[PDB]
């Protein structure tokens, strides 16, 4: 798996031309590891070999990803913010869209990205069937808008991997 994702992570970056994109897996114990990583020359540092905990992600945010599969983080400069609210229900209903074409990230996240000096970020969760095995994330030093058309082509490119991460689970 480690080897296969090393070649895949490189292929995406070359296409998305993003300075940094890597694969993130999740361990039931809460620990997460980056087993693959493509870097743009050397503007941003290498995070490979470093274990990141799931704490990085809460829950509600993941819901929309599991609900609307668009997966996009807007310019940390535009200052768009997401937030929690009193008890609520009917989310499982799976209502078509029903929300903006973006997923604002709470300030706590704003710094998280900015602290890394990244103005924008593209994501594409790696899931097999009904399960999520990891998280795809791209980072670059620029607050630029993304196109839905080009996004899909890659969205599919990630689907392929979904097969590799899955097909790999059996062999391994």
Ligand X SMILES: *[C@@H](C)[C@H]1/C(=C/c2[nH]c(/C=C3N=C(/C=C4\NC(=O)C(CC)=C4C)C(C)=C\3CCC(=O)O)c(CCC(=O)O)c2C)NC(=O)[C@@H]1C
- Among the listed ranges 85-93, 101-109, 140-148, 159-167, the one in contact with ligand X (CB under 6 A) is 101-109
Q: Is 19 marked within a binding site? A: no
Half-sphere exposure of 82 (CA within 13 A, CB side): 21
Q: Which is nearer to ligand X, 97 or 170 (CB)?
A: 97
Residue in this structure with the two tokens 């209903």, named with its chain if needed: 93
Whether residue 160 contacts residue 122, with contact meaning beta carbons closer than 8 Å, is answered with no
Calpha distance 42→141 (Å, rounded) = 12
Residue in this structure with the two tokens 């940094």, named with its chain if needed: 20
- Among the listed ranges 1-9, 57-65, 145-153, 156-164, the one in contact with ligand X (CB under 6 A) is 57-65
Question: By CB under 6 A, is residue 55 in contact with ligand X?
Answer: yes
Q: Is 13 marked within a binding site? A: no
Question: By CB under 6 A, is residue 105 in contact with ligand X?
Answer: yes
Q: How far is the CB of 129 from ligand X (least distance, A)?
A: 19
Q: How does strand 36-39 pair with strand 31-33? A: unpaired
For ligand X, the binding residues in 152-171 under the rule CB under 6 A are none
Question: By CB under 6 A, is residue 80 in contact with ligand X?
Answer: no
Question: By CB under 6 A, is residue 57 in contact with ligand X?
Answer: yes
Q: Is 62 marked within a binding site? A: no
In sequence order, which residues have a C-beta less than 8 Å from that of residue 103 and are 6 or more positions away? 61, 64, 65, 70, 71, 72, 73, 74, 82
Q: How far is the CB of 22 from ligand X (least distance, A)?
A: 6
In sequence order, which residues have a C-beta less than 8 Å from that of residue 118 and are 6 or more positions away? 20, 44, 76, 139, 140, 141
Nearest of 42, 4, 35 to residue 20 by alpha carbon: 42
Question: By CB under 6 A, is residue 39 in contact with ligand X?
Answer: no
Q: Which is nearer to ligand X, 49 or 96 (CB)?
A: 49
Residues that bind ligand X (CB under 6 A): 24, 32, 34, 52, 55-58, 61-62, 65, 73, 82, 103-106, 108-109, 112, 121, 123, 135, 137
């Amino acid at each position: 798996l480690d080897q296969i994702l090393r070649a895949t992570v490189e292929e995406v970056r070359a296409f998305l031309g993003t300075d940094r994109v890597k694969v993130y897996r999740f361990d039931p114990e809460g620990h997460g590891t980056v087993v693959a990583e493509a870097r743009g020359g050397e503007r941003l540092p290498s995070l490979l070999g470093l274990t990141f905990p799931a704490g990085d992600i809460p829950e509600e945010a993941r819901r929309l990803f599991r609900l609307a599969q668009v997966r996009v983080i807007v310019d940390v400069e535009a200052q768009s913010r997401s937030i929690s609210q009193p008890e609520s229900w009917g989310l499982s209903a799976r209502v078509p869209l029903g929300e903006p074409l973006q997923r604002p990230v709470d300030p706590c996240h704003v710094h998280y990205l900015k602290s890394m000096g990244v103005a924008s970020s593209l994501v594409v969760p790696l899931m097999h069937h009904q399960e999520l095995w990891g998280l795809l994330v791209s980072h670059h030093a620029e607050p630029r808008p993304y196109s839905q058309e080009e996004l899909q082509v890659v969205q599919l490119l990630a689907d392929q991997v979904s097969i590799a991460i899955a097909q790999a689970e059996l062999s391994l």
